[model samples]
Target: NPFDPELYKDAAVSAETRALNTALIDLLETSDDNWDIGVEEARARRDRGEGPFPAVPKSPRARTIQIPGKGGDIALRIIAPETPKGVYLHFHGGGWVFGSADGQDPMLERISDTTGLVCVSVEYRLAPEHPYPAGPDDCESAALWLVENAKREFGTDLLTIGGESAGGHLAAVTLLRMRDRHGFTGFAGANLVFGAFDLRWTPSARSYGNDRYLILRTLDLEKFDACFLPENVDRADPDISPLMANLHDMPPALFTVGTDDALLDDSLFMHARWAAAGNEAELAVYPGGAHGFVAFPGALAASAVQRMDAFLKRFTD
Candidate 1:
């Protein structure tokens, strides 16, 4: 009943997957149910080096640099191997309101250590302060910098983009902007993982209920949409919602989504759209997996990360 296509069967979570998924959900469930706070309050906590995000051993490998961007200088957290084969432009996810580029250092370092791809994460501006085209513009600037500088900076022009959740959305936006605005198709591929491609809501997003076991509730998503976009912005605008955009002429991509994710239908609908639009796309459906499942330290998380690493490597190599 999710979609009338062949994916309703392929994307459905199985009964047997409940055991692993339940255990995964239990580990990720937090006492910090502070999703109800005002947007300004959320911003304050984030600026003070605080929030519910788990603390990690700060990575020693990453270096921060500034580049000229649409609004102003955009800070970037860079993790580069000594001799990189390509560049992976990473956009950190926090619903465009709650994350920093430096937050994912350890994971970015791991990818650098293994994939020989230089990872550059953009510290794009957050919302209620800097909204709509601000975040996307910053990312596009970072991308444009690489297009001009990758050969001199990283020694190769090979590029791929990915992120968790909102990052995934930005990756698609950047790709589209590059193609449409500049007539550039330099990106080799995209690693779109559990991305919220549609803001107007897919069937699954419309039907998703607030559940304790999963990472996001319907209300949580509502706030994200409200916070990221401005008033009177068309929710169905192709630039804002890539799912609504024509999927033609985009790069080959890997669309990873958990079957139980609130944005499950986003990926299901997008994978079909991508392929039908004549692009190569790989859809990964992790049964019973929740949204942002890749952040946790476990087998399911490891599985998704491993596959992404492999996917990125294919283009870089």
Candidate 2:
């Protein structure tokens, strides 16, 4: 449909997917037992799942390298195919406070396997310890490094950047930094998945779903925002919130978000801005899906990834 939702009809979805979503929703609802706990406790619990997903096998060619950044060296994980077609600079999602390079191995492997693009996942510094410029600094440095070396290292300068949630925000910020700060335009495309583009909170972000939603509620973002952006910093700053930034001369971009996602408008508004600037931008809104739903193996997430692969292939091939 032009509205972009496959439509949330349990009868239309496979029984397997329906059951999985049911269980996932239940898990998310019950997990709120720790919602009242402090951020450290919540972080510790989530950090346990920071590495690769147990179900997804690690890519044999996956290896780590140290890249020079403003703050010491940053660890970058490269998920390469035997013969690379291009490169995708990936950032992991954890509200900019959590998540590591290894946390994205599954998707990196999937992207590499499907597109033949070497996926370089950056292990940027997290917040609540190394906030603000720390994460973006590392990401920009990694992107610069790739822009300078992709052709020499991978035999092609064709490149794309993407991420989920906070990673999506960083990916957009990194792209802007590349364009305005360094005057570079080597990136061919971007795939932003349910990114929280408006740190000040967009309309969709403000009212996505109740606390029962599997991914996030508006209230949860306050803590995440405080931890990432400093008190003196304005959340509307383009660097912190890409939606507030100039959107001219951007690369072709794909934005995906669930209809029920708390950050739904983040993608919607960002895509509108992207298109308003006369850039190629596509948006896909899946019905009944929650935040980070793409990570869940199901028809919706799979189709989203398939579309992303196709978009990348158009430029990479």
Candidate 3:
């Protein structure tokens, strides 16, 4: 039953999301890369409370906290769960272009309910609007804010960081930045869902071509170039590409992917690299799935969630 009866309905919904995301991405004229419009849109949603997420509770009750951004303020929406032993700090995935905490409501609700952790999803400034440093900087600021105040702010004993796609990329970079600059003490674990950790064209990316839901190889290469600062920026800067980061003593991580996912190589590479470095890493590849597999959970959906529940069980409890 991989093809659900609601295939048409799901396609309709996905088409809407893609259309909106495309328009939002199109607005990024090179000069406007540093504009605050994208973040403002996300902030407005935080103020509004409800967002684009589906199958979530009518009212997910999140309170927003303003944190310093590279240029403006970043919005962090705190989702308080009943039992609060673990706090999951999240970043929204939009290929580092156009996504926000509000855009990821169902993900937060499900994770909070299943893991019993207070999920604090962060809306970092999007790229081609704020670019590389801005996105990663906002993520670092959020991590610092949590490490310094997560226990006091949400009464949690453990911390985890996660995001999908671009957000997942930021999560990886944030971990490196926290460790290298901020003393490396926060976050008990990380959840990277079909993330594009390395933007530089890789073998996997090249092999995938224009296949399925992934951004084609040539497109991915161009976008990475567009989002970074300038020609002088280092590709292995860890913050821009987490898979290239140094993993001497990084926290444990969980990566999920579908066989058909375009960025499966990045996740596989990350897991293999971490393993070679003698770190705790786990990878799950769903059969016949694509980039958005984690987001689709009805019949075969619970399997991914079950894996996530097990991954965080030790720290959440």
Candidate 4:
């Protein structure tokens, strides 16, 4: 009952959840659509600080600072409580083409307030312009900086990471790179949310022709592969696709997704891999959640946030 889902069929979830979901879908169906937009346009919109819809007001509690990263100075948005117990490294999802570190101030601030952990969001470079290694390189740099400075900067050894959509992909890749390159795996937990683990398009992603409530379609999904990565970029490379990498020696993780997400299989497959590899991993599936469901309002969003809070709280001590 923690994740009250949508139940419209003969199948039953929770009536309250269906009500909330219906309300959310009603607005989403008519809201601005990103499926038809090109990467350049999307990047322009983001650079202009606009969303398909009106931008959510930024929180004052969130602050940005620059640090040395794999490439150059990387921007990181930090939302910290008076005294934080741990640090949660975050990546925002925009198919690796458009999202920025400043994009999720409200959500990051909410996480900081609820989890009482320092929430640091990485502002990695986007694609088509920067392409492949640019974004991942930025994330790896930011992550390494945190690993070396968390104790001195935030005064804690507790560390965790997670992201949304495209961000989910970067978070996982960055996590692996941390271990592979630095020989360090001191992370306590990972909060992966509807990330794209398999760039090769899972069954769900390929089969997502169109749903009335569809946030992402197969055709739209392919564009990311075209723009962010090069033509010959090995989609199955362990570095490019975490699903193709070894899951052993990793920290515990929480993988969250929705039944309706085109990338649903990404979390499911990765969760199983992590567990089978003898790593502690948990999966949270919201029955009717769309790709970025947590951004919407509903019992589902509430429950997901609660689960995230509970998951991160375990490392507080």
Taken over the whole model, the C-alpha lDDT of each candidate is 0.81, 0.81, 0.69, 0.82
TM-score of each: 0.89, 0.90, 0.78, 0.90
For residues 1-317, write the lDDT of model 2, one tens digit per residue: 52534454544455655576667767767654334765567666656643222333566678987879998999989988888899999998988876678765777887888888999999998888898989999999999999888888878788899998999999999999999999987789998988988999988777754656465777668778878888889887899889999999889999988766788778889999999999999988776666887878878788887888887777766
Runs in model 2 deviating more than 4 A are: 2-19, 32-57
Clashes in candidate 2: how many? 0
- Can you write out model 3's per-residue Cα lDDT over 1-317, one digit (the tens) per residue? 22243432434234434453344334332222313345456445534653333223433477789987767888988777866878888988766765567766666776777788888888877766567687788889989888888777777759898888777888888888888997775678888888886767457666776323232233554554676555667776666677887787777888876655567788888888877777788887655445656665443346777887678766765
Model 2 steric clash pairs = none
Candidate 1 local distance difference test against the native:
0.81
Which 10-residue window of candidate 4 scores lowest in summed lDDT? 1-10
Q: Output the TM-score of candidate 4.
A: 0.90
User: Which candidate ranks first by lDDT, i.e. highest?
Assistant: 4
Which regions of candidate 4 fall more than 4 Å away from where they truly are?
1-10, 13-37, 46-50, 211-213
**Which candidate, 1 or 4, has the higher TM-score?**
4
Please report how far candidate 4 places residue 46 from its true position, in Å.
4.9
